[PDB]
């Protein structure tokens, strides 16, 4: 219950002898589990190691190496679990311990209690004094023994006590080796105290036990749950009776080495059933139920400062010294301006022009709290589309009264500021654009959020010569305009859409995948809804309990592709049977394998279990 990280230092040691003891001590002090290896080099003759008989657990290896003490204090070293391993070899690695010709070096290996490596070799050799360690039976530890290989261990030295010779750590009689898993009787799955069927340890059980139940164990093969070695903590979800379906269990645990935890240490944070240093990328650190965890982003939100504030207030315009320092940005914190300076570059004095594609590092913004001044743009980049995700366009901070800009563009056939729905404050200037369309077609009065916002449009290419070029809003689309070509590219849809593209209507009645229609969007039905042919809608409203015949079974309100078959209940396993009618109900309790019906002489019974 004490806990400690490693070191990974591997033969690497300080040079001043005397820190490198005081170091070793400074870490594993009073640590009972070493989560990470336990590192022991460099260390001279007589120095105490007294202090190592708190370390129990290993979850790493243990490195003993270029030491010249006479006694290894690990007594109560039960478990090594060689989640990583030395040289990507061995749980334990023992070696050249011994002073260069001299006499001082490693005699005895005080490992009374080291019943269990659960995973990795040993290698034991190059130690001119050390005696006794080739008498233990290392097949009894070491739970993979493949390769053999990587299992050696080899060696005037003094005799085992006679209660076991031929097998000890020391003279000592209680340092004799004790066996738990070789003298075990067939039914054993494991471990155990002794050579008969009822000495068998618990399944969970690793190291050995001193009794039948898994709170008896020495060390747990998997986790530790409040003193029970389980296979797993408390899932994240159980099935609740009441909304036949699985619920957040609120006594779920979290996993944190070998232990079940209901709160993760300091530093950590909850990424689905573990604890970890931080939420991956998919996922953001979100309170939900008095935990911090990670929650799946639906790209994952990061604030960044614009041109002209914090880390970038002395820039004037985006460039190729800055662009990517926009990186995977959500929301810019201020102003997003383009000038001729930031797009050529300057190549006389070495300073990049803008690389076209870096530009597409904003297609992951969707706000901007200031202003958008586009003065300049790569010649042959037709729209803003690089903006696509944009949604929001703050205006908190105005160029003179401006918001939005796009002056003297050439380059520029269409807008394409396809999710653009919102311009908070400020006046919009498009001018200058002589070949850019679809500006006339918005109703930018939409955007807005107050009457005190005006807008400026002069000499774009004439409404006129583009309406009659074939530059026109799709007829899927509203009365608002289009940011460009196609059904994708509008303000409103004028009849429904599915995603981003406006469409006539809904797969209500027939598709691949039928649909149901929420205030003119599109949604899919739960994949559990039976489609319905003839003028029937398969589903009004999302869910498996909102379906209009289900598919396969039922389960209280919910279509499910099968009754309940063992799914993890609060107290126990969850079983149903189905009815004539594919309706699910209860198995009887004393049912732990399943049902044919609700008696109690309905019961089933696993098919794989025995010979
Ligand atoms: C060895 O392990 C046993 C079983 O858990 C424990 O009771 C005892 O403290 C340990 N004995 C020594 C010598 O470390
Ligand atoms: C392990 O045995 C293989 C089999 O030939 C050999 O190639 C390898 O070098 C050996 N490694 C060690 C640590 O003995
Ligand atoms: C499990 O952890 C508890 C602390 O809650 C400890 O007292 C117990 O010895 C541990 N059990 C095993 C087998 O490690
Ligand atoms: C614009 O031209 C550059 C020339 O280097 C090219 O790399 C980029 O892909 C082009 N961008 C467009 C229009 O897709
Ligand atoms: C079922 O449909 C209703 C609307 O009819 C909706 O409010 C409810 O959330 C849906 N239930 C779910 C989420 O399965
Ligand atoms: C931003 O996220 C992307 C996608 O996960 C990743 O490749 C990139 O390294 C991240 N950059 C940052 C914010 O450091
Ligand atoms: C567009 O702006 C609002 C509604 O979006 C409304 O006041 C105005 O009449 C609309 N114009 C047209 C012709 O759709
Ligand atoms: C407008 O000028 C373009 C040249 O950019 C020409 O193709 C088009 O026919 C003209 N339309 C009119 C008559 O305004």
């Known amino acids: 219950q004490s806990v400690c990280a490693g070191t990974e230092n591997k033969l690497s040691s300080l040079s001043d002898l005397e820190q490198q003891y005081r170091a070793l001590r400074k870490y594993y002090e009073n640590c009972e589990v070493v989560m990470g290896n336990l590192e022991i080099t460099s260390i001279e003759h007589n120095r105490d190691l007294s202090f190592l008989r708190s370390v129990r657990e290993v979850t790493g290896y243990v490195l003993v190496a270029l030491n010249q003490f006479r006694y290894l204090p690990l007594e109560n070293l039960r478990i090594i679990r060689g989640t990583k391993l030395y040289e990507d070899r061995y749980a334990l690695a023992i070696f050249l311990n011994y002073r260069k010709d001299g006499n001082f070096g490693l005699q005895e290996l005080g490992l009374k209690n080291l019943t269990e490596i659960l995973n990795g070799g040993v290698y034991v050799d190059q130690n001119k004094f050390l005696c006794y360690a080739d008498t233990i039976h290392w097949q009894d530890i070491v739970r993979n023994p493949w390769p053999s290989n990587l299992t050696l261990v080899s060696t005037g030295c003094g005799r085992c006590h006679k209660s076991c010779t031929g097998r000890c750590w020391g003279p000592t009689e209680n340092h004799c080796q004790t066996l738990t ?297 509203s009365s608002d305009g289009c940011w460009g070509p196609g059904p994708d590219q509008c303000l409103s849809c004028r009849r429904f859409s599915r995603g981003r593209i406006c469409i006539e209507s809904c797969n209500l009645y027939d598709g691949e995948f039928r649909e149901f229609e929420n205030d003119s969007i599109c949604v899919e039905c739960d994949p559990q809804c039976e489609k319905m042919e003839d003028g029937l809608l398969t589903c009004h409203g999302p869910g498996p309990d909102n379906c209009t015949k289900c598919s396969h079974f039922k389960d209280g309100p919910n279509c499910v592709e099968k009754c309940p078959d063992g799914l993890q209940g609060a107290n126990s396993f969850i079983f149903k049977y189905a009815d004539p009618d594919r309706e699910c109900h209860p198995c009887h309790p004393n049912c732990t394998q399943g049902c044919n019906g609700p008696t109690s002489h309905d019961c089933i019974y696993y098919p794989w279990t025995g010979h």
């Open 181 to 477: 898993r070789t003298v075990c009787a067939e039914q054993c799955d494991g471990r155990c105290y002794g050579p008969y069927v009822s000495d068998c340890c618990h399944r969970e059980c690793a190291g050995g036990c001193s009794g039948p139940k898994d709170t008896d164990c020495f060390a747990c093969m998997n986790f530790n749950d409040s003193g029970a070695c389980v296979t797993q903590c408390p899932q994240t979800f159980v099935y609740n009776p009441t909304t036949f379906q699985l619920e957040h269990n609120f006594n779920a645990k979290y996993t944190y080495g070998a232990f079940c935890v209901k709160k993760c240490p300091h530093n950590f944070v909850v990424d689905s059933s573990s604890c970890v240093r931080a939420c991956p990328s998919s996922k953001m650190e979100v309170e939900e139920n008095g935990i911090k965890m990670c929650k799946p982003c639906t790209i994952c939100p990061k604030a960044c400062d614009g041109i002209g504030t914090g880390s970038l207030m002395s820039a004037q315009t985006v460039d190729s010294s800055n662009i990517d320092k926009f990186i995977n940005c959500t929301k810019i914190n201020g102003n997003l301006i383009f000038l001729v300076t930031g797009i050529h570059g300057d190549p006389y004095n070495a300073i990049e022009a803008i690389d076209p594609e870096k530009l597409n590092v904003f297609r992951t913004v969707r706000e901007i709290t200031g202003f958008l001044n586009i003065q300049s743009w790569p010649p042959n980049m037709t729209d803003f589309s690089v903006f696509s995700n944009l949604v929001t366009i703050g205006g908190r901070v105005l160029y003179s009264g401006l918001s939005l800009l796009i002056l003297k563009q050439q380059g520029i056939t269409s807008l394409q500021f396809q999710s653009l729905k919102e311009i908070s404050a400020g006046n919009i200037y498009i001018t200058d654009n002589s070949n850019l369309c679809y500006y006339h077609t918005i109703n930018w009065t939409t955007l807005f959020s107050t009457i005190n916002q005006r807008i400026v449009i002069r000499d774009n290419r004439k409404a006129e010569n583009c309406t009659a070029e074939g530059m026109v809003c799709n007829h899927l689309c």
